[PDB]
Ligand binder design. Sequence first.
Ligand SMILES: Nc1nc2c(ncn2[C@@H]2O[C@H](COP(=O)(O)OP(=O)(O)NP(=O)(O)O)[C@@H](O)[C@H]2O)c(=O)[nH]1
Ligand SMILES: [Mg+2]
Length: 188
Amino acid sequence: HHHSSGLVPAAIRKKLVIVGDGACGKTCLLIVFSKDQFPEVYVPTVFENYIADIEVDGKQVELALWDTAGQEDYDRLRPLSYPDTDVILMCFSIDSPDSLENIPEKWTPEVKHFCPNVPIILVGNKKDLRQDEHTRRELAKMKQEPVRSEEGRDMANRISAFGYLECSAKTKEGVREVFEMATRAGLQ
Ligand SMILES: Nc1nc2c(ncn2[C@@H]2O[C@H](COP(=O)(O)OP(=O)(O)NP(=O)(O)O)[C@@H](O)[C@H]2O)c(=O)[nH]1
Ligand SMILES: [Mg+2]
């Protein structure tokens, strides 16, 4: 199922799990949040084990960041990461409308199966690529275009996400806000 354009008109301890299609930017997102530095050379498939400290709404939170591999090859073992999750970051890439279509097709059924009633933040990654010339040209040859914010929002509504946010690990735009939202969701 490929995306069709234009159809949308004391410290508290919490476990966060990030999921989404391969290469949609999960690990870079965790790294930029944790280390404040975009990895421009080497990126591990999954980020090192990591507990981040974050203050949100006057509450001090420790966020364990559980990275997962997006590729189908890892489907059998990925559910090992789901028990006792407090919040899910469910990602797609704005430069890949097909990764958005995998939200309802793959990720939402998987997460809702293993993490029933755990809040989901839908996250559009790689926001910097929305108007990027190479991205537009590459997607145009497939009759597609970068994900529009309204398409992300519609999808977040469709899957009953706690919220929808866009970010760019590369530019840092909106990264802090993603994790602040996840923290708010994990707290309530
Ligand atoms: N332009 C741009 N590229 C990004 C951004 N975040 C990550 N990337 C790029 O996207 C590619 C994949 O990033 P990565 O974080 O490894 O993706 P992943 O979702 O962790 N992949 P996997 O599921 O296989 O572990 C890398 O080449 C990285 O440089 C971003 O915000 N903007
Ligand atoms: Mg990764």
